[PDB]
């Protein structure tokens, strides 16, 4: 049997996008976009909550703890999928 | 101001309980503007403070806009305590004390003690 690094419920994994001008530049720059994940997340459980909630295959998940405790996840979407047009259905 | 915050039994503020109800037609009993009918509009149930309309005259001042433009004065009608309001009906135009009855149905309602009128009236 295979278990997840931890039981976080999956849905609770992502919380909200980041609406800073820099993240807008990254959407328009790399096929990336930023999420704000709760602290017990992975590159497996974030890499496998976008390829199964937006229908887009993801390339990288560079995630980082943030000086106040919560976590922040740059995701690079594979080039074939283009960032801005995907964020447009999301509202960004 | 801590001396006057809402009082809290374990996460909540005690609500007191007042005879007056919203939409009530009251006479001011004693304080200040004694003897002036009114329609309550808004009950602050933790202090027993009740604003009845068009009576209490507070002349405040308000900075309106962000450039100092306008800021024309507003005249708000502020609180009055609950023990200073009795009930009146236009028919028995007279102050009274509240009461209670269990009418022929199950329900239980107000009953002005000095008259025969019913405070509860219809549900709406």
């Amino acid at each position: 049997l295979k278990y997840p690094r931890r039981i976080l419920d999956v849905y609770q994994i992502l919380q909200s996008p980041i609406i800073t001008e820099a993240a807008i530049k990254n959407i328009a720059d790399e096929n990336s976009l930023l999420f704000t994940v709760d602290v017990r997340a992975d590159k497996k459980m974030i890499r496998e909550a976008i390829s199964n909630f937006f229908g887009v295959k993801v390339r990288k998940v560079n995630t980082l703890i943030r000086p106040d405790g919560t976590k922040k996840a740059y995701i690079m979407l594979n080039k074939e999928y283009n960032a801005s047009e995907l964020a447009k259905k999301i509202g960004i | 101001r801590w001396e006057r915050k809402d009082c809290k039994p374990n996460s909540l503020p005690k609500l007191h309980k007042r005879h007056v109800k919203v939409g009530d037609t009251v006479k001011v009993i004693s304080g200040g503007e004694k003897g002036k009918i009114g329609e309550i509009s808004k009950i602050h149930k933790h202090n027993s403070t009740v604003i009845i309309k068009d009576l209490n005259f507070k002349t405040k001042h308000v900075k309106s806009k962000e450039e100092g433009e306008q800021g024309q004065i507003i005249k708000i009608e502020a609180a009055i305590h609950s023990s200073n309001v009795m009930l009146i009906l236009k028919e028995q135009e007279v102050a009274d004390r509240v009461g209670h009855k269990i009418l022929e149905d199950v329900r239980k309602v107000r009953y002005l003690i000095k008259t025969g009128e019913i405070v509860d009236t219809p549900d709406r």
Binding site: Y3, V10, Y11, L14, N52, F53, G91 | -
Partner: protein, 90 residues
């Protein structure tokens, strides 16, 4: 206005209805970023509805008879395997 339907749902429909609830709630959270502000009216209800589902299931589990420890273990054997699904709304 009360939910006399969850007690009519069997286990499966109850369960997938839970997941769908959490999804649509994910979307509501998502909307806050782009400020479509109907949420306060009907955000908490969503949240405050999944709880009903969970409560109903536990009572059902209780008549049948399982210890809290056993129930906890059962929950983990279910939390462990679940795949996120897009919400029905598209």
């Amino acid at each position: 206005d009360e939910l006399k339907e969850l007690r009519t749902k069997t286990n499966e429909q109850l369960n997938e209805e839970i997941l769908q609830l959490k999804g649509e709630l994910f979307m509501l959270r998502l909307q806050r970023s782009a400020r479509e502000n109907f949420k306060p009216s009907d955000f908490g209800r969503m949240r405050k509805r999944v709880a009903r589902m969970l409560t109903v299931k536990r009572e059902r589990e209780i008549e049948q008879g399982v210890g809290k420890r056993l129930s906890r273990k059962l929950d983990k054997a279910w939390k462990r395997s679940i795949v996120v699904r897009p919400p029905p709304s598209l």
